[PDB]
Symmetry: D2
Subunit: 492 residues, 4 copies
């Protein structure tokens, strides 16, 4: 494939009740291309008044007897597979939008992000008519069963690093279970989500089942979090804002909350691992998606015996990483999302140099149009450095050294975060020992960034609350109702 020539941006308004609407305020906000600095377009900016209209539409779409509630579960599923067909048909357009808006290299957006988008929808198409309750051999003369009903109106808030993929991870399980959705994409990256609105009507979802409100966090986002007519909030973003979400939910509605927050994830390389493979996988674990991954392996612990050769190979690999235009096939790494993130990264890079960490390569911006940063590698990192403790969310790799398994297990878990972790070793006893010991929601053995819709994903400690994806992720999108019926005698 190749990028869509002269990409037309035709969906820029708020999506409520399957209709495109203006701001109630009249205000719009700009969208920028992080590779060039230019302004792509203006998007209608949602605020509290627009959220209330979205919630009203989602609440009416969910009313008993409505088309969405009466629909056969198997038909919710076919609606989700139809959306997958449409995203497949419009694949190159959508990957061009994610590239133009998110700075993702186009071929990565096409073959990675968009593939996961289509697979997520097809996976949850299969689940809709396979959500089961139970019947229970209860004490006494009763017949007891549970029903797994949709919760109702689900408010969803997502960040900017995987716009289209996040969108699908949120709405696919929600819809599969029969909920209706008020979703606020990141203000940095609203474009693909809005295009998804057109596909969503084209697929034939009833009006109001999905409502897409682009806008800012403290306005549209905080309106969702505090709204009294929203039954559930799924939030993905930073840990500090996640604290605000949980506070707002208790203070307002006691709405149910899922949190997917930040990480500072350890990647543990043992000496007996394949050096070629572990170096490239730890390099991808840092630099994938411009380093803007919550799953970034940002604390690479290397066994003493190989640390020095590991540093040499990682440095060579980072020194060859092709930075440049996302539309160029050779580009490995695009720009950071915006200037605020760009500066956040460079000040962090300065912090590591000001502390005692050896800067092997990189360290500076590139000076080009946009927000490009040189692939950066620190060695001699110690656990006390800001670099080893704060989420960089940029193309900065940090290599630490360790001696014994007990040591590195302690140090990997010595963190307020616990999103993910990885171990590289051919030894089965320390593979399972380390993986069992990690306080993280996902552990990889001899791989990294293996995420899919089939597998539960979420954080330990302050990295989140609850789980997304897989059969477990469906639990957060239904309510359990126990029906107990008095019966004359009961046998079995």
């Amino acid at each position: 494939p190749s990028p869509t020539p002269n990409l037309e941006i035709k969906y820029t308004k708020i999506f409520i009740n399957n209709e495109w609407q203006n701001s109630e305020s009249g205000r719009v906000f700009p969208v920028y291309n992080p590779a060039t600095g230019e302004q792509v377009c203006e998007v209608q900016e949602a605020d509290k008044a627009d959220i209330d209209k979205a919630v009203q539409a989602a609440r009416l779409a969910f009313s008993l007897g409505s088309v969405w509630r009466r629909m056969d579960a198997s038909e919710r599923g076919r609606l989700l597979d139809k959306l997958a067909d449409l995203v497949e048909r419009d694949r190159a357009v959508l990957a061009t939008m994610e590239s133009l808006n998110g700075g993702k290299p186009f071929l990565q957006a096409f073959y990675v992000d968009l593939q996961g988008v289509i697979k997520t929808f097809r996976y949850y198409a299969g689940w809709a008519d396979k959500i089961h309750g139970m019947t229970i051999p209860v004490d006494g003369d009763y017949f007891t069963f549970t029903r797994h009903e949709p919760i109702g109106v689900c408010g969803q808030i997502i960040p900017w690093n995987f716009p289209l993929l996040m969108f699908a991870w949120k709405i696919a399980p929600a819809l599969c279970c029969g909920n209706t959705v008020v979703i606020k994409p990141a203000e940095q990256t609203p474009l693909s989500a809005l295009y998804m609105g057109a596909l969503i009507k084209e697929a034939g979802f009833p009006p109001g089942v999905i409502n897409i409100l682009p806008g800012y966090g403290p306005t549209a986002g905080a309106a969702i979090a505090s709204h009294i007519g929203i039954d559930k909030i799924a939030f993905t973003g930073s840990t500090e804002v996640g604290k605000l979400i949980q506070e707002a939910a208790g203070r307002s509605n006691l709405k149910r909350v899922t949190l997917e927050l930040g990480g500072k994830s350890p990647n543990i390389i043992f000496a007996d691992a394949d050096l070629d493979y572990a170096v490239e996988q730890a390099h991808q674990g840092v630099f994938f998606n411009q380093g803007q991954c919550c799953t970034a392996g940002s604390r690479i612990f290397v066994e003493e015996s190989i640390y020095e050769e590991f540093v040499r190979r990682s440095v060579e690999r980072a020194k060859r990483r092709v930075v440049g235009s996302p539309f160029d096939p050779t580009t490995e790494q695009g720009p950071q999302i915006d200037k605020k993130q760009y500066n956040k990264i460079l000040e962090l890079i300065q912090s590591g140099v000001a502390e005692g960490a050896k800067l092997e390569c990189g360290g500076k911006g590139l000076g080009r149009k946009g927000f490009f940063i040189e692939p950066t590698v620190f060695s001699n990192v110690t656990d006390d450095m800001r670099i080893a403790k704060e989420e960089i969310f940029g193309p900065v790799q940090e290599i630490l050294r360790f001696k014994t398994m007990d040591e590195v297990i302690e140090r990997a878990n010595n963190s307020d975060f616990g999103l993910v972790a990885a171990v590289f070793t051919n030894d089965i006893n320390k593979a399972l020992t380390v993986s069992s010991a990690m306080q993280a929601g996902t552990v990889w053995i001899n791989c990294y960034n293996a995420l899919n819709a089939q597998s539960p994903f979420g954080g330990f400690k302050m990295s989140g609350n609850g789980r997304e994806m897989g059969e477990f992720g469906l639990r957060e999108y239904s309510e359990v109702k126990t029906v107990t019926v008095k019966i004359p005698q009961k046998n079995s």
Copy 2:
């Protein structure tokens, strides 16, 4: 059985690391007999300082390599079985304590509460080695499985109306899953829980696995809810304080939260129901446990054609209900828990009179000592009235009337609470149409207050988050870890 005659209150101290302790302040607080107002004893009052060393004890009990962590899961179950055996052995003393301290009729405490305590422990003893993760057929060369691990230190706060039963409902699933516990019982009712510390010790639970910290809400409770060393909090359950729990969770360390909150539950009697049976069930729905049940019971909708006869027989039965001393085997209704609850019920009765409800019987307290209230019946109650909107934790029955199944489904669901519902009818279509439409975590058909250990319990809307009991009660007490292993080839 009969009450243990003199009853010594042997256990009045704080239970930390399997040792009895004085409060760090040296303060004690009194405990009263609700039927006479007399002071039963004084109990060591835990504050922030005792919470601190309880969490320290529980965290050490939870560290890798500890006796509790290394134990076979099946042997976790055995301890829960030994604990139930000890409760069954001392069943009379515990029933006397629940009666003396909580005002429950002793026979009710013996045959209902204490049976529900023994069965809770035996149910979850069996679950301990049957908590399964899964293996997932993901895309690509991967072996993906999930482990369910304990969350860690669980802080637990319970109310006063079912002291021993709620204590079991809280510690049993937590221990079944391998957690350690810091539990604060209600300041009114700490005696049953403290006796359990003695039986927890005699059963052989490792030190620090369970710590029992009597004290008050703004001190011991708020220290638990904000404690940055507690990984999960389970709360029961006024809805006002529930908001503060969830806010304090997001404000502190984003600990996982389960809430079991208030209720104002509808009971719908259709004309085609066994009238004699429905009158006695709806009467037990409001007056059971002195009306101090989250599952009342408190909005009885009766179809027009049987409304006069239903009211007539309800008033006949309330007037016959035997209020008196809990130790007396003829007593059906003991006192309310204390003066503040007594006053709240009497004020809500006044507001019912002051709004057009027909005070058919009752309305005032009984006698001069203790906190006895007459069984009170209101008919001609309408939705907008305060008594119909706010929960009266007291012996106060409110009878509304209805035509049409659709009307009463609207009126039943029109509520911020959704803990419980019941429908009485012999028609299968009515029973299933109404139970499916109810916005409540538990719907009983032709019965009321059927709360078995095998079946989950929890609220819709502002009545709580998450579920207790059943297999689903386990879900709140485990963290899910996904382990994804790269493999050479992969075949089905």
Copy 3:
């Protein structure tokens, strides 16, 4: 829609390894149109030698590292999705084949049979990547999990009354689980199965994954049952042949056996039921698909109170039932499948008149071009008549009477069959007492012949071994492997 007029039957060969083949012997057998007597075409006649080639094809396709074994589970589902796409496209052709070969009215074959096929494939397409093993909290220093793998070559033998739907019901769960399949359609109706072979090739299934061998029972069928290279057999047919299947499995290689066998299923009508509706449901419950249904409600028990009028409304309805050519929209009931079944009906019909039941209507053939039988109703049937103990499998409705609920449960259960049962009533206690006490694999309340891919289906007693359809159906097509790993220490 209207049938494909003069339809060529293109596919008449044996389907092995995605190739069309002649029988080893060179023998062919005739296929007849049952509404007309005339010969439709000639089909290659498989025997033991062809079954051996097919098994060899299925075993090689199942070998480790083959395309079918290495395919992602999600891609198995996509293949099942494509098959449904194709069946939908050629829906008119396949319904026409089902009429012309099985004698079902084309309208009911287009809107019932072929909808069941498309929905079955689509359902099991979703299960493919959702078949999960478990991880087990086992005693000792061990890590234990289970894999759910395909069993291998599955032999499948199906009858003639729902040829295409039986075909889907068999291969869809088998392929969803990753097995390879040797299937033998009924000698009477191989044509839609053989057409499905061409769509299977077009859809993309690897060679050898599905092999279709038309032929007779004692030759092709017995070859499958005693083949030492087949790991599992799924047989649907008569009870007498089912005994031979289980016996042949035991004598050969102990292949796993699921049997779906005969039925003489009860249908209980209480007075407190909607006569209008219940009469039409009991009518369809025995006359649907020309009475050639294993689920046929062939023992209609009616409460004395309404026996009178039930017979009158049933007879009035049967005398109106339109018998005619399958391609005519007005036809409700086509012919029986062949002369053997035809003569079996009337012979059993004669026993009814000779044993003392009132022939209320029908009871004879039509103008003998095709095997048409006039709709027949026996009233005053007793429990010991041949008409009440033996499967008639034709348009014959037996109506008995009963007085007491306990009497009718005893009478309905007095049978060696137990495939299905139905109770019509509006009383919840009666509906639940009767359904719980029925010795039947499927109990319908206030409906009949409600069957989906989603629901487990099978016989109690001599009506079957094992279950098909739904999730429980998947268990039969999968083999459990427990893997236990020694670990250095367990933390639980």
Copy 4:
């Protein structure tokens, strides 16, 4: 612990309906001590007449409304828990019985066998009230759920090699699901089964729930297998008799069959394994329980690099393995069960020598009384020798050499059996690949042989059908009934 010095055999009668009966013929059969040949006692010999009486006791105990059908599921768990308490109490007596009757070293029977009996009952005691059906979201206006009823009367036949344990493996899941049981222990070892009858009566099981009929294969065993009043047969034993059981069940009443039929299980030692640990574990894998183990690692494959050292260490360990009296705490190996087994082992050893396998130690009987055989090791075994293909059930170790993982995968799997397998390696890729390619119901990695109550256990291919133990063991003891209710509207 020490043996129960004299041990009178108290219980020698047929156990039906909780009463001890004489045989209908009056005949008794002798029970021998395998260490001395001396007769231990006489036991009533059950035959067809006795099975008939036992089936109607079990059938009446299973009737709707009986004590066993009406009892709370949880109460069945309590009874199973009581049986474990009683076995625990009489652990010394039962271990002495198992040792005296079965020849097991007393310490082995006390600490291994009896611990497994107790833990089996306590595991399934927990499952009784946790057997759930489901509620299914089907198309149309339906409420579909499933109930998991008991099947009915379950006949059960077990061998002599783990008499008490396999008794526990059979009845625990059957009773946990609520069936009634007619169980025939092996003619060699009926004593500990009969003593359990005393404990079953003492534990409070209703009469007829468990009936124990000691007797012989073709007489009492075959009458069980072909009985038309038995709904399910659970058989553990040889593949040859397993064929007859499955054949008998097809020819009689189509009862449900599960088969556990033993094997010829491969044990693969890679060069990168903990060598001394592997030598000891492969030794135990062969010589545990006098080699009379269906799990016996009878084909140990050793990588050529370490073959010579492995053989030498195996010869040393085998030559120092203490053979002697079961009651001596020094004894690791007791006698074989009887003269038939002794002779069959001695012949097979002769076959190995005649066919060129190198006999490194042992090969002859030991002494003049009892059935002791010298521990025996065969050096250079090849896959085509009779000893490499046939189950020996004796203290005979067979060591083969191999070069390549893919070679040893083929050779391990080239067999009609597939009960169990093991691999020893520290490489994670070798352990995963080999465990996934094994055609065996249980694969151990770096151990042998961990059989818990939590883990399913059964054979591939001709090693059996279905599974025992764990949660999957309960699936064979329940029928599934689908109930489908028509409902007016349905809202998803």
